[PDB]
């Protein structure tokens, strides 16, 4: 068993250790070839055909670069081949839990199909990782290459989903290893760096963030009795620009008005198909689209394929679901009516989403009257990854003249031209009735609703 | 109105409303579910791109080249109608591709149905006919000034060639319109230009060919009482490099040893699934993977999805097909045994595993255990130099077409323009079987005086 | 005929024969010998690009935008003549740059000649006049359908603004004045070329899609004037354009060391100024600081002046040559600190004296550099986007305004700030320590932010 | 003294050890900022403003990557920090000898100005490296960071120019491979090529087909003829034929562009007319000419592309002839291409060719008769870097199944679509008299000359 090399358009030649190859060459990992990174984004940006598989390889590769680089610069950290392998495995496996159309699945479908459960694709990744290990005899292969499976499986999981020192996989003196793949402190992790580059390459938008530079300048210093990753103070401006780029990719691509409408329609189709579709899990037991998340053998076979299974079906019980997807192909989509924003420092909460179409329909501003069933109200939260908080206040820096002393850099020390808030909310309204007289009316309800709630007058 | 689409290769592509109506059909949107490079994606993870994107790009580039000839030479009398027809042909030229693209017409259909002669291009014509007829496109064409009887014929002829001037869609004085999307004279067409750029972008290999430059320098001149596209004489070196790039993309990516083995395995899985899978066509009639090419309503639903349908199946009659695809996920692939060089004709492909298995070198193995992959590497015209079939003009006389021979360009160019490679693989992957398979292979090579 | 030029930023650029005649003059070819980013090249080794390349690119982009407005809206009655004039203005808009570009009009001339008010744009107009008059271009213009009196005025007005305030073109072609140098809001093709080109060469990636902006640009009536309007959808991308510009200033153009190198070159030029002779019209001799008064002399004033000084043996140039030798050895002046308030151009000269008078080795005003850096959105305290007109899909001739609250609550609350950096010319341990003490006391004395 | 980081558009963040910084921050190195990589190419391809300085940093960086990567993959090679520093210094300094407008200077000007001497920019690089060391107190700085200057200076020089039975003194046979990184004498596959392909492409606006990063990942060291050499993975053989293809392709389109070469010829003409009147101050205040400054590195230090502008901006009447030639470049009244043809003609015969053309007696046309001074005859050699030889026959490969056994791969084992020849020669003729009647005549002399020497009808 040797090294394999994989050519990636974002990263070039990626070297994979034989243990990583064994993990990649499983049904649980190869599944990611059949789930698009950007979901309904592909129906607006035709370049965005990229799947989670490619992304996952890239996060494994970048997880490895950052840990290797900290190791070469600071030998006193005593970063081991074992540490490197575990960090790479976590990068490779961090997105195993994604479902059909990625963000659509955990952002839209599961909260509507199963309001009782709290599910994240990250929880899924842990469960799918457990299934992958156990059903492909990976524990002995790990031992062969010097890993200790009890400690290291825990470590890999904790890197994906998170956990007085709360972690068991590695002690405080390797705390920094937990900032690479998924950074809970501030969000600055290699996962972001891969998706910015990859999404850009494919969308046809250009990426402003130099991850290779950030890596060269990263050191480990002591902060609050913990060894953490610190950035060179000089790079502070570039980190505010990293979040700016992320928010900019959300505005243009990920929350595109039509991409979101297509995700909403697919979600609608899935909800109508949910009672009739059967996915075979462990012991031949049958699961639904919404329950396959409870059985990883079933979940393994739940991919973007589900879209085509519904579209190509002839069963009359799937007629409603299939008609929604047929309307996507013909491009008879629901129609955008307008966008607006809360002026209040209080955002609209998930509890209130269901009641919004009713509120719009009750606006008393007309030819055609319209009903709550005719409106979609899409509520979009845009932030810097920590609700109302500035992520950069949670970043540690060093200076050239004292590279072991960690410091904080406040927002006033960087620039007066930076954002005064780090979270905002956008509300888009669409209409399901698409003729001239209905759209005109829908727009009237929308503007009056905006006046009724002291929201921003629309464009 | 117009719609704008952002593409990573071409930037902002403007689509006329008629083109939008054609794109927004099930027959076109189907191309979202067929990978450009098929099994290449299982070697080059960037190659997730599908035929849909490519098809938009050929529509766009077909439009650039025809617009540019029109602006430079108004005397050609290129009409908005001509432009729309050329764009529609670029959009629709790849409608006939099946699951995993080249795999489908290169490997599967010739094995599943040896009696028929099928190309994805014939498929594109049939799928175009189905698309028109089932989406009420003829009246939309008339609305924007096309004449459907003439123009549908013209669009088809652009895709597949004619159906002693052989064409009906357009007369001799617009002959050049037939060289844009699919060039039968020499292969220099916008379809190549899109795939070089797109495949490169995604594979992670860099493209040496500047199509935008070629377009700026393209003119139409009279050659043998026919108006054809000519290249600026200065560009001759760049055209030899275009074919060099194509052949280079075949060596590294398209005929990758493992990419081809994965295509062979998928093909194997399809042959074992063929008798048991049902695809619903017109009037509810059922078709097989290999027969869906006879019914375009069925064919519409035959995409890369078929791979997952087989993989996720529980039916025992699909166990054999499903096990082959499961071995792809585990990466227990068929194993490369060796490569060699003579040409061997398509007529002989089926009989080659038998020939290998009959080698008696100084575990025995059977013909079912060997794959013999015959790979033709050329400049798109068998043994011929495509550039001998290119017309050029000079700066000082831009209407006089000329030929440029190979000795006038460089003594460092290829002496031949076609060669053939034969690879052998084994389906039995253990130590003792591979060793044997290698012995059969070398003795076979000695038996046929190959390298 | 036409010539084609391959550019790494724009691909194949087509040049009409009249534009070739303008390019093939000493006054234009001069721009091959002036670096776009000046002292930036001594920090970012990719930034070897010169103003010539940039100038071709602005000519090309000026042409794309005007051609595209013409194809989309024939009712504008944009003529081949209008197109040629806009292209010529793009080609010639940067003719006035001096040695090391921004250094020359930002730093050297205000110090060498405080009495005069000079911009490279005024220079471009004068150099354009010289180019025309000394290369017999007026009859060549007439040959290809221009009307030189009207059109020369038009080209100049495109570069520098008015000299309805315009004479070269009436109100119904107002929009032609927004292409090369946009006085209303700063959104012009000149920005677009430098973002792309600077990025390509610096090794930083450009976030702004100029080709997209062009596809979406229309002309609509605003206040009885036909202006360029952007598609409403693009408002977010325009805030990001200014964000990108400001980002290129933070990282590259105002790099601490790039600015120190510009300051050192400026210092060398000030010491060489009285001893250099550049031959102008009538054989009259000009200095580096006076060559801006005579375009024949100015023609021969390029980055070459740096090497002339560096390679000299003349004792009168010893002081200037020693400063430039210290740049090669990399014995640069040393950064002491940064701070923030605004300080006006009138006050720049007096600042080293103010620092040296701070009472916290003693040090003197000649020992300090005080570099005042203005970071804004190109209109001082103003939001440029409040001065942009937009159209909607549903009514593409109705122009509208879009306020900042309609776009995003995550946008800047301010559009201008000022940074002050201090450096010391005396580089030993004891001097730097002292220099830092003067600096912090000065900051306390003027109620500036205690330094990082 | 620490590390410095430099951002390069081709290579990204380049790390430079303090010793390398000391070498870079000298007048002898910084000089390369004032010499364009592609010379007269910039007057055809406006993107090609790049100078030798940037290139030189890039070769230092790539020299370092390749040696570091061989070291990480094969610890048994015993590659030292010292070996790495020496290879990097050689990459940084390999182009120190270039003169004004790069190839123009050693290809055209010096062979015409000083036919007696044999000069290459590489000899210059060695001499300039010696001057750089000696005049900037670098020997002690080298010792500070663990180099041994007598051995290591020799090693660095030998890497640049070749040796000065195992011919090398700087390093023994077991580190032979270190000599293949910067300038490969065996086959030409070196990091110097890799930097210029990428950089030239980036700037010219032509796209690069060669993946140097891939080549590096696949490079190993194996034993060949009792010597440890760099070997390529057998699978990469096709990509190496494509590397030479790309080089030859960059020569056809950019480096030997008809007008780029004419501009180099005009600059050379201007330099020859200025050579007697320009004075460059060298060591001890002794004065050198443009053509003699190559004999004194203190003078040579101040000889850059600046010399072009010094001549252009001059007012001295003795420089009027030289200055008028350069003024004609700005106005674009260039010398005019008359024609091209193909046979080889040897360097010994270049000088005599304009005379041969002018002696052609064409069947009695001729308004204007023309003289040898009126013709330029440009002889252009297009090859794979080894005259008539296939460089790939001089490459060693390994297989996956035996990565320590080196092998050869013949051309028939790779492809029947590869070149049958690896060298050809082009002859271009130009005329200095540019009016309609002169060009027509010049073309008549040219075709008769071609008939007289049995060359291809043009
Ligand atoms: N950029 C690039 N150029 C190429 O020429 C090329 N060829 C392949 N690849 C990509 C495809 C893959 O992403 C990666 C590995 O390809 P490889 O062909 S070295 O590997 P194995 O077939 O496994 O050969 P073995 O088993 O004998 O070592 O490089 C390439 N990528
Ligand atoms: N029509 C279409 N087909 C595709 O296959 C496709 N792929 C990407 N895009 C891009 C191009 C489109 O601009 C974008 C959104 O689709 P749209 O325009 S239909 O939907 P709204 O804007 O809500 O409706 P309208 O303009 O009719 O009022 O997606 C596409 N658009
Ligand atoms: N490069 C780029 N930057 C962007 O900011 C951007 N925004 C969208 N796209 C891509 C996505 C598509 O491929 C294309 C069109 O997206 P569009 O937002 S203009 O259009 P419709 O939604 O149809 O809006 P309407 O109906 O009001 O005209 O550009 C973009 N592409
Ligand atoms: N991208 C690119 N590829 C190339 O192969 C190439 N060759 C040249 N150029 C660049 C160099 C220039 O920037 C431009 C045109 O050079 P050109 O060789 S078409 O033309 P003239 O010398 O003018 O030949 P004539 O007088 O017969 O037209 O393209 C090229 N640019
Ligand atoms: N090195 C350097 N220091 C500086 O302080 C500086 N300031 C500008 N530049 C460089 C960066 C660019 O390459 C160029 C910008 O100047 P141009 O004359 S093409 O246009 P404007 O109308 O001045 O710019 P805008 O409208 O955005 O204010 O000069 C600078 N470069
Ligand atoms: N790509 C990129 N992004 C940037 O934001 C950027 N900023 C600078 N550079 C380039 C400029 C140089 O090529 C390189 C390092 O510049 P640096 O600003 S880290 O370094 P010193 O000023 O020497 O500061 P110290 O001594 O305090 O570490 O990166 C940059 N390159
Ligand atoms: N303008 C121009 N004309 C030319 O004839 C020419 N020839 C080379 N160059 C440019 C092209 C490159 O930028 C560089 C090549 O010369 P270098 O000193 S970096 O290395 P070598 O060892 O000579 O190259 P190799 O080993 O491949 O034969 O000079 C040229 N540039
Ligand atoms: Fe991820
Ligand atoms: Fe195609
Ligand atoms: Fe400018
Ligand atoms: Fe070199
Ligand atoms: Mg995730
Ligand atoms: Mg995250
Ligand atoms: Mg096809
Ligand atoms: Mg074809
Ligand atoms: Mg300017
Ligand atoms: Mg401006
Ligand atoms: Mg060299």
Residue numbers in the entry:
A (entry chain C): 113 to 275, 284 to 485, 489 to 582
B (entry chain D): 114 to 276, 284 to 462, 467 to 486, 491 to 579
C (entry chain B): 114 to 276, 285 to 462, 467 to 485, 491 to 582
D (entry chain A): 113 to 276, 284 to 462, 467 to 581
Paper text:
In terminally differentiated myeloid lineage cells and resting T-cells, SAMHD1 activity reduces the dNTP pool to a level that inhibits the replication of HIV-16−8 and other retroviruses as well as some DNA viruses. It comprises an N-terminal nuclear localization signal, a sterile alpha motif (SAM) domain, and an HD phosphohydrolase domain25 containing the active site. The active form of SAMHD1 is a homotetramer where sequences N- and C-terminal to the HD domain stabilize intersubunit protein–protein interactions and incorporate four pairs of allosteric nucleotide-binding sites, AL1 and AL2, that regulate the enzyme through combined binding of G-based (AL1) and deoxynucleoside (AL2) triphosphates. The allosteric regulation of SAMHD1 has been studied extensively.
The structure of this H215A-SAMHD1(109–626)-Rp-dGTPαS–Mg complex was determined by molecular replacement to 2.3 Å resolution and contains two SAMHD1 tetramers in the asymmetric unit with electron density for nucleotides and metal ions found in each of the allosteric and active sites. The H215A-SAMHD1(109–626)-Rp-dGTPαS crystal structure contains a Rp-dGTPαS substrate bound at the active site, as well as in allosteric sites AL1 and AL2. In this structure, the active site Rp-dGTPαS coordinates the His/Asp-bound Fe, two Mg ions (Mg2 and Mg3), and hydrating water molecules. Several amino acids also interact with or pack against the guanine base, 2′-deoxyribose and thio-substituted triphosphate, including Gln149, Arg164, His210, Lys312, Tyr315, Arg366, and Tyr374. This suggests that the Rp-dGTPαS substrate conformation in the active site is representative of the precatalytic state and is consistent with our enzymological data, which demonstrates that the Rp-dNTPαS diastereomers are substrates, albeit with a small reduction in kcat relative to canonical dNTPs.
